[PDB]
Amino acid sequence: MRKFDKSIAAFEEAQDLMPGGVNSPVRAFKSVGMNPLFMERGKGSKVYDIDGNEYIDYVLSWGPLIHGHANDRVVEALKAVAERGTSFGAPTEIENKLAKLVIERVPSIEIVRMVNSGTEATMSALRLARGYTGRNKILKFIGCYHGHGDSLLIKAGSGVPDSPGVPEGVAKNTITVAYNDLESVKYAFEQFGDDIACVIVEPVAGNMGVVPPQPGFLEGLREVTEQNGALLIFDEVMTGFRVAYNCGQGYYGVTPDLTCLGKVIGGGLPVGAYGGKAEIMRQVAPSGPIYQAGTLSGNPLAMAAGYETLVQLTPESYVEFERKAEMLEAGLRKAAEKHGIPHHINRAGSMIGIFFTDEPVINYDAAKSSNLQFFAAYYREMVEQGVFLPPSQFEGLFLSTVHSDADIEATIAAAEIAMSKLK
Amino acid sequence: MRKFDKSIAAFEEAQDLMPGGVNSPVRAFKSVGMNPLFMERGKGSKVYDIDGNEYIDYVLSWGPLIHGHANDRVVEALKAVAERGTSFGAPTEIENKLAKLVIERVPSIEIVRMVNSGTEATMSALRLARGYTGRNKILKFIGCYHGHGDSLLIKAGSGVDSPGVPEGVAKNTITVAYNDLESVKYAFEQFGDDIACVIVEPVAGNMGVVPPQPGFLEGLREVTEQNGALLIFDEVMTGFRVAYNCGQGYYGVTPDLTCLGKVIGGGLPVGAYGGKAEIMRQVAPSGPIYQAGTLSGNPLAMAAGYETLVQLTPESYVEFERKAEMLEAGLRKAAEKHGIPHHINRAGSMIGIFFTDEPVINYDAAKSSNLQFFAAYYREMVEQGVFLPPSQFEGLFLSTVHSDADIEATIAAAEIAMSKLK
Ligand SMILES: *Cc1c(COP(=O)(O)O)cnc(C)c1O
Ligand SMILES: *Cc1c(COP(=O)(O)O)cnc(C)c1O
Ligand SMILES: [Ca+2]
Ligand SMILES: [Ca+2]
Ligand SMILES: [Ca+2]
Ligand SMILES: [Ca+2]
Ligand SMILES: [Ca+2]
Ligand SMILES: [Cl-]
Ligand SMILES: [Cl-]
């Protein structure tokens, strides 16, 4: 029987310091109605709470830890940079080294700009798209999260009416359509087409759980934007370096005008980036008039973590991710079928998510049919069995290059027990 | 004679990779017309370029490096955290430790929320003010920079109005001159029912160092209180730098919300917004105001911030003020000697020199600085081994490790640079 005494006491302290006792809303474990787990350390695919409990980690800091916790190569590079200075406020050669790697790895990126988060990357790409086209409106999808820039906080799904504090002056310039609903994007262009600066889309939706694009969706977005003079922006903050070697755009063969990156690009440190066609990126200050800056953007510590992370990813890493994701899908499918549990498993490249509904999960509306009581009961038992999954039905399982076949087998064995207690 | 050949070759490569070859506009050294210096390493108050040139550093990454480069305690704390994992996406005890220190250090902060930058801190504080008051308009000052959130990119001054910001956003931002309380009163007379907040730097730092005039900050507190608007202090630069208890503690003016950054991270990407508990309670997950961040409160950044802040004592500020007084005297002595127009501003520990005899009390007066004198002065300071901010519209940053010998060498270098202007 797992004990959470130390985590309970630390959360009593936290609640008197931060809103809801956390620095990010999902960390309060409210979706599963459990006491939040306080983490002490990690190594590879293993994470340890302050009560000394060990877990197989499928959260990986919500995506960044593609090589798990404390990867030796990343750690040594961080220690070497720290001794020489973590930030200078002037150019460094390490910034060149990561920018070159990102340009080579991401198809659409010819010129890149580093920032400190995915929120900074998407807000900057929207400003660039509006400035480049001379247009006001942006189109996004219902149930999709792109960070907390005001224009993007409209119908942002699970966890996010729409956030107060966002004026009508902002809301009026954001159009929202159901993810995977190509015809409704086409209809929006019939009304707003020459005032739409951009369409922003996740190549695989990740905030409504894992929802892959339907056939013809992404290709359709590329067609409608280019025919109407709008930019196509791929928000690859979660998908980038994770769904495939050359990202979602590489995986599906659809090339956007601009791409936003985060999460894995930092390998455990706060890093984001936006990049794309050279003629568009040239409009960003100091080369152009569209202002964006950051004090810690491109700092050597974050560039080293990001470089050491990305250089260790090869095409073979993704073949292994796909093999493990297929094994997890089969094991979860077998456990749900054995116990008569409604379930739908989505898989796109390395990404995988299980929804507690029999409905085919193709959009936010279908995702919302998930049985959240079953999710919370399944989650509670997975914690008891030593598995740390994302505490939300509206998230996929994150894999690392360090998950072993023994980890996968133990996860499936835990899921069988967890499914057996639902009904 | 100093050589910059390796920095020149590295910038040639950078220009094919990033817009303007940089990750932040100031780094391109365009205000001074020079080849950007590529930095390799630093130690204490010393910074080294890739050509092997040593500099006395007054940039300190534009504020964060209050203990200079590679402070041993900060480095040892980063190394120890890295070995155990830099980010978990679940709560940690180190986040409690830093939040507790910040709540104690910053007067107005009862509840705090960590973010990854000053830009994230200010955009969130504006959204919270609008949500809390149910109002749309924000008031900021001309020539002041609060980060790149769309609402704040109006009259943002030196380096910055940006295209890509729709009129839908612009119509909700009111801008008036810094240190002009009467225009603020007028703005409240005309639009007061719709003003969610006034955002202000306790000491302006983006138009060079411009301290507040008598009655300005108090007047902002009074006008906001009386009209139901919040008072937000942008202490991203002033926080933990101008005084032990920040700008608000130094001037004795308590805002509703405070934004932090820069020194709070000690050289790592960290920001924060905090304030009255009943306001902060409206932020998610406690309330309906949405704000989140994946790397927010990560242990590596919490450890860097904690070790940085715990090492600052009231005595650190007595020493900063002593050194800033020495710099002001020596710089003033050099300008008078060479007949150079000058105005030196000092607020707490902060210091800036303007190449104008006009009293610099706002952006319009700061704009009277002779930029050709600034660039000529700057080029000679680099030749003498001093790394200053490459802009007239920035003050000099001191660290706890700048020695008296560093200060004296800086003054002697300024004497030579002033001698070549006229
Ligand atoms: C997490 C995420 C973001 C925001 O990134 P942060 O670093 O948390 O600000 C943006 N877009 C997507 C698709 C994400 O998953
Ligand atoms: C630098 C600065 C900011 C922005 O902080 P970043 O971390 O660069 O986003 C905000 N306000 C003030 C006063 C600043 O000096
Ligand atoms: Ca490319
Ligand atoms: Ca082209
Ligand atoms: Ca900057
Ligand atoms: Ca306080
Ligand atoms: Ca009170
Ligand atoms: Cl939907
Ligand atoms: Cl002015």
UniProtKB/Swiss-Prot annotation, chain B:
One of its GO terms (biological process) is protoporphyrinogen IX biosynthetic process. Coiled coil: none annotated. It comes from the Bacteria. The modification N6-(pyridoxal phosphate)lysine is found at residue 262. It catalyses: (S)-4-amino-5-oxopentanoate = 5-aminolevulinate. InterPro entries: 4pyrrol_synth_GluAld_NH2Trfase (IPR004639), Aminotrans_3 (IPR005814), Aminotrans_3_PPA_site (IPR049704), PyrdxlP-dep_Trfase (IPR015424), PyrdxlP-dep_Trfase_major (IPR015421), PyrdxlP-dep_Trfase_small (IPR015422). Pathway: Porphyrin-containing compound metabolism; protoporphyrin-IX biosynthesis; 5-aminolevulinate from L-glutamyl-tRNA(Glu): step 2/2. Its EC number is 5.4.3.8. GO terms for molecular function: glutamate-1-semialdehyde 2,1-aminomutase activity; pyridoxal phosphate binding; transaminase activity. The keyword Isomerase applies. The keyword Metal-binding does not apply. Keywords: Cytoplasm, Isomerase, Porphyrin biosynthesis, Pyridoxal phosphate. Homodimer. This is Glutamate-1-semialdehyde 2,1-aminomutase 2. It comes from Bacillus anthracis.
